[PDB]
Amino acid sequence: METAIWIKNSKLPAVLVAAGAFDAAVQALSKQVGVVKLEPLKKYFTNIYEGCRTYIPSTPCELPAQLGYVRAYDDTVSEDQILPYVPGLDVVNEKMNEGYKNFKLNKPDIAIECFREAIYRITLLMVDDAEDEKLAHKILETAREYILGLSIELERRSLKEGNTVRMLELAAYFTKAKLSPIHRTNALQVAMSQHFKHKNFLQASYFAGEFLKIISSGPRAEQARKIKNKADSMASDAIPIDFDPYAKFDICAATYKPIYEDTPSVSDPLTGSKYVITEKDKIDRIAMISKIGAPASGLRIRV
Amino acid sequence: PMDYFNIKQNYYTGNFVQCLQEIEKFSKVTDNTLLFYKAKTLLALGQYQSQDPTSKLGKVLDLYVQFLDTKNIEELENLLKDKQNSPYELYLLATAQAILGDLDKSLETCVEGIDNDEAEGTTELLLLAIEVALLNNNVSTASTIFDNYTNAIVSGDNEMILNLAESYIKFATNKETATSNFYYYEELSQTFPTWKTQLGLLNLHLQQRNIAEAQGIVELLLSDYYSVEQKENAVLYKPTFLANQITLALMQGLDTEDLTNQLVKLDHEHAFIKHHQEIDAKFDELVRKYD
């Protein structure tokens, strides 16, 4: 009877999953966040269903063990709040912190795995709170920005020497990802020294200046200052690239090109990443479960 | 009364060695309760041996231990078919039926023998009825059976059996999880510290989201007094121990691959693994259906 209490009290995808109503949960995710590829969510469905269940020994032990349920709240709440226990934002923050740790250690694939996991956990959250709901959305957008920047940098690294313009463009677009300032420092350092190496002194000076307004002391700040001094003395760019730091644009999460306000674009309804128009109906690169440009009613995590 | 109090008290808490001792105090004496509990206690110790091949109950018990290996019920059923069977006999037949997955038939076998509450073994069979109904997710029937039986009334030694049944109901219904039910399980873990009472307390902490206390009891069971000194019934309770660890890890966000693999190797028929394979297939089928 517990499962039907759950479903009567909330149709959140998390609650449907906990109840075993996998099909109804998949349909709800389809309408709400455009979910279309299911495999990357399997573990998470599994995690929820088994996380709110526990097994006590029977008498005798040969008899199958008996199933009990872990609820969301203790018994002091009304009957319409009888809800499954679903792990919350504190685990999500742990996954994000592991992402940041792998980012600092220059393990970008593993960082991406961590940010993707936090996104999948947020897709199946249950909060009871306007502040937790807003916090969940902000973390989701942050994880997307970290995945986007890391994917730009992995593309840059994958490049054959001789794709110098594409490489310098990617180095620049990496600085556009909305990481924390201390993390944006990594991208600015890449962009600065790659543009300096390739005789793009105007670019190098911009990236060095942006670096120095976050980190002002230490040996990287001094490297940045001497790079900026030399670059300001040269005041030239050997290789023009499509990049205006003062314009308003986003980066296409599939082709890694700037999308200006007049550029026709579509977006992923789940992660909010943006794409050039030829990516409509394809699967989002950030989390790889939802359909770019699909009609969607919006993420539901608030009971 | 009280003849059986210590036998039953040690059996239901999982103190099977001390249970056998309490039974041995009746050296060279036998009745159907002594037979029933000595057979079940020897079985739980991994040391079963045929106590009374002569009598009806003993034949049934040996058929039952055999069934546990063969998983074939035909002999047991054909022996009890159309006969006037006692509650102890029905206990064993209905446990077998329930192990086969036939929970409806099992509950009916139980209900057969619950008429008279002054008949030997009836309280035992009532507990089994409760357990078998809860296994089939028929919680309202379990409550009704228990309420009607108990209001319709209690010997000193059956008291613990009825409390055990009630506690299974309260576990399945999250009823006073943090007050009376938890106190019951914790008191038993303190007075009769065994694998059984310890896992009961652990389940009650998990239901309360008390990660720290759950982990404390997991560490305690992993220590030497339980995992080495009690290597005997540690084996009996290991699969449920593994399932519990899995739910605690999942509550923390930790990986459960190793634990799930241990459990599936050790007891691929554990309730956790049935649920696990079922949701695995359910999800893979959805994946296929929407492609």
Swiss-Prot record, chain A:
GO biological process, one term: intracellular mRNA localization
Main location: cytoplasm
Molecular functions (GO terms): structural molecule activity; ubiquitin binding
Annotated signal sequence range: none
Binding partners and assembly: Oligomeric complex that consists of at least the alpha, beta, beta', gamma, delta, epsilon and zeta subunits. Interacts with the ESCRT-0 subunit VPS27. Interacts with KEI1 (via C-terminal region).
Function: The coatomer is a cytosolic protein complex that binds to dilysine motifs and reversibly associates with Golgi non-clathrin-coated vesicles, which further mediate biosynthetic protein transport from the ER, via the Golgi up to the trans Golgi network. Coatomer complex is required for budding from Golgi membranes, and is essential for the retrograde Golgi-to-ER transport of dilysine-tagged proteins.
UniProt key word Protein transport: yes
The organism of origin for this protein: Saccharomyces cerevisiae (strain ATCC 204508 / S288c) (Baker's yeast)
Keywords: Cytoplasm, Cytoplasmic vesicle, ER-Golgi transport, Golgi apparatus, Membrane, Protein transport, Repeat, Transport, WD repeat
Superkingdom of this protein's organism: Eukaryota
Leftover remarks: Present with 15200 molecules/cell in log phase SD medium.
Protein name per its UniProtKB record: Coatomer subunit alpha
Subcellular location: Cytoplasm; Golgi apparatus membrane; Cytoplasmic vesicle, COPI-coated vesicle membrane
Lineage, highest ranks first: Eukaryota, Fungi, Dikarya, Ascomycota, Saccharomycotina
This protein's record includes keyword Iron-sulfur: no
Gene Ontology cellular-component terms listed: COPI vesicle coat; Golgi membrane
Swiss-Prot record, chain B:
Xref: Pfam families: Coatomer_E (PF04733)
Coiled coil: none
Compartments where found: Cytoplasm; Golgi apparatus membrane; Cytoplasmic vesicle, COPI-coated vesicle membrane
GO CC annotation, single: Golgi membrane
Assembly information from the UniProt record: Oligomeric complex that consists of at least the alpha, beta, beta', gamma, delta, epsilon and zeta subunits. Interacts with the ESCRT-0 subunit VPS27.
Any GO BP annotation: endoplasmic reticulum to Golgi vesicle-mediated transport
The protein's name: Coatomer subunit epsilon
Something else known: Present with 23100 molecules/cell in log phase SD medium.
